[PDB]
RNA sequence: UGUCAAAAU
């Protein structure tokens, strides 16, 4: 069998819907754009829009379409962009066609992929951001294309309700993370700070709603990302710590999901905010006794122990002395209630750590 | 002793 056989029999669909036939088409498809067999196969692919869009939706057919994307020049890409734009929203939600869309985002010329990105502006973006398939399309656009192709997403997520729904979703939290990273990893090389204004418009909702976001089963991760980020998002980290966590550390160390946020905050914060957090913990049966004997706050106590142990090895010796004070206070309270703590592993681990350091 | 943590052959 050869390709002239499938061109003469008009059987492109019948091999591309088969596994072995599509692998034959992929292995023998000519890569040079001026080959006649290349052009005849391309015409048979794109001459009927319904056939093309059904081949994009196929379990085995899509791959051949993806190979046609890898070999394509600008004239072929214009036709492909028009056919994809006619059904882009359902193509993004499909298990097979979304991979064609993602490869198109990587491989098309930037104005063509910009056109496809801006086609989605008036669709249902929450539904697209929370789908198992379309989330990856949104992330591919954000991490691939320049920002002017997707600032409508920053405007969309500037609304508070939209942010909460996407951030609290299993998949949309990943979308929020990728957008914050892309807008923060850059702006450093920029001279006019265009991306950090967009990042401030995005992070205003996060700081405005971060108590509910930190208490959530999926949005907590997003709240941990900012705090764990570093100097790129350090201002927003410090805003979250001074506004949300302070005067609420006793409550959220006891919650199932927000205790991870409190733990990450003890792990990654400046000394002033750490000192204010230790002030809140040691100055409310008081708060440290509650957190030693709690199913979630015990891990917060362990994190305080670890950030005092690694904290003592510091250049400024005043901060190191305060770290020693805090660790000595924790050590004294644990040796006061060691008898009961030994009953549960919650305490065995805490003691083992306090034993490691004498 | 604590989290549902990302879609094809």
Q: Where do runs of H (alpha helix) occur along A35-130?
A: 36-46, 49-56, 61-70, 74-85, 88-93, 97-107, 110-119, 125-130
Q: How far is CA A214 from CA A253, A304, A349, in A?
A: 11, 19, 26
Closest CA to A216 of A243, A176, A182: A176
| DSSP run (H or E) holding A334 | helix A317-336
Residue at the smallest CA–C1' distance to nucleotide B1: A346
Contact in structure between A263 and A303 (CB atoms under 8 Å): yes
- Find the Cα–Cα–Cα–Cα dihedral A341, A345, A348, A353, rounded to 10°: -120
Domain ranges of chain A: 1-121, 124-245, 269-358
Geometric angle at alpha carbon A70, from A65 and A72, rounded to 5°: 90
Closest CA to A265 of A239, A227, A210, A232: A227
C-alpha–C-alpha distance, residues A215 and A234, integer Å? 21
Smallest CA–C1' separation from A134: which nucleotide? Answer: B7
Closest CA to A184 of A229, A145, A220, A216: A229
Q: Which two tokens stand for residue A322?
A: 């305060």
3-state secondary structure of A342: coil
| Protein CA A276 to sugar C1' B2 (Å) | 25
Residue appearing with tokens 């990856």: A136
Geometric angle at alpha carbon A35, from A33 and A39, rounded to 5°: 70
| List of A residues 88-147 with CB within 7 A of strand B | 95-96, 98-99, 102, 132-133, 135-136, 139
Closest CA to A125 of A156, A160, A83: A156
Q: How far is CA A347 from CA A139, A259, A300, A301, in A?
A: 43, 17, 12, 10
| Protein CA A75 to sugar C1' B4 (Å) | 45
Q: Which two tokens stand for residue A334?
A: 């644990």
Residue at the smallest CA–C1' distance to nucleotide B2: A296
Residue at the smallest CA–C1' distance to nucleotide B6: A171
C-alpha–C-alpha distance, residues A258 and A244, integer Å? 11
Question: How much of chain A is helix, strand and coil, in % rounded to 5?
Answer: 75, 0, 25
Resolution (Å) of this entry: 2.9
- What sign has the CA pseudo-torsion A165, A202, A133, A49? positive
Contact in structure between A58 and A51 (CB atoms under 8 Å): no
Residue at the smallest CA–C1' distance to nucleotide B4: A170
Q: Which two tokens stand for residue A152?
A: 């409508």
- DSSP E strands, A230-303: none
| List of A residues 59-88 with CB within 7 A of strand B | 59-60, 62-63, 66
3-state secondary structure of A313: coil
- What sign has the CA pseudo-torsion A25, A30, A36, A42? positive
Q: Residue A327: CB partners within 8 Å, gap ≥ 6? A: A305, A308, A309, A312, A357
C-alpha–C-alpha distance, residues A287 and A284, integer Å? 6
| Protein CA A60 to sugar C1' B9 (Å) | 7
C-alpha–C-alpha distance, residues A167 and A304, integer Å? 28
Experiment type: X-ray
Burial (CB < 10 A; 0-12, 13-18, 19+), residue A32, is exposed
Cβ of residue A156 lies below 7 Å from strand B: no
Smallest CA–C1' separation from A295: which nucleotide? Answer: B1
């Amino acid at each position: 069998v050869t390709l002239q056989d499938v061109l003469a029999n008009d059987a492109l669909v019948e091999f591309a819907t088969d596994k072995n036939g599509c692998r034959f088409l992929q292995e023998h498809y000519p890569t040079e754009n001026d080959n006649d067999v290349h052009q005849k196969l391309f015409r048979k692919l794109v001459e009927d829009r319904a056939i093309f869009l059904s081949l994009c939706s196929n379990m085995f057919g899509n791959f051949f379409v993806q190979r046609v994307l890898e070999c394509s020049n600008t004239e072929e890409q214009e036709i492909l962009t028009e056919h994809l734009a006619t059904d882009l929203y359902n193509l993004c939600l499909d298990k097979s066609a979304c991979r064609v869309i993602q490869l198109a985002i990587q491989k098309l010329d930037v104005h063509l992929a910009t056109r496809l990105s801006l086609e989605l502006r008036d669709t249902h973006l929450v539904r697209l951001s929370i789908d198992q398939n379309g989330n990856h399309v949104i992330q591919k656009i954000v991490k691939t294309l320049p920002v002017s192709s997707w600032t409508f997403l920053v405007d969309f997520f500037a609304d508070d309700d939209n942010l909460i729904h996407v951030c609290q979703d299993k998949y949309g939290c990943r979308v929020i993370q990728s957008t914050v990273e892309t807008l923060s990893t850059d702006q450093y090389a920029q001279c006019y700070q265009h991306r950090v204004i967009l990042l401030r418009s995005l992070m205003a909702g996060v700081t405005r709603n971060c108590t509910q976001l930190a208490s959530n089963e999926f949005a907590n991760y997003v709240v941990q990302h900012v705090i764990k980020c570093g100097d790129a998002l350090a201002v927003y980290r410090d805003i979250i710590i001074e506004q949300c966590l302070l005067q609420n550390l006793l409550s959220m160390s006891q919650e199932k999901y927000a205790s991870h946020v409190v733990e990450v905050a003890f792990e990654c914060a400046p000394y002033r905010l750490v000192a204010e957090m230790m002030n809140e913990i040691f100055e409310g049966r008081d708060a440290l006794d509650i957190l030693l004997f709690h199913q979630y706050g015990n891990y917060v106590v362990q994190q305080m122990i670890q950030t005092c142990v690694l904290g003592q090895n510091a250049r400024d010796q005043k901060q190191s002395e305060m770290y020693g004070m805090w660790l000595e206070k924790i050590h004294g309270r644990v040796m006061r209630n060691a008898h009961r703590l030994e009953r549960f592993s919650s305490g065995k681990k805490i003691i083992e750590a306090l034993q490691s350091m004498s």
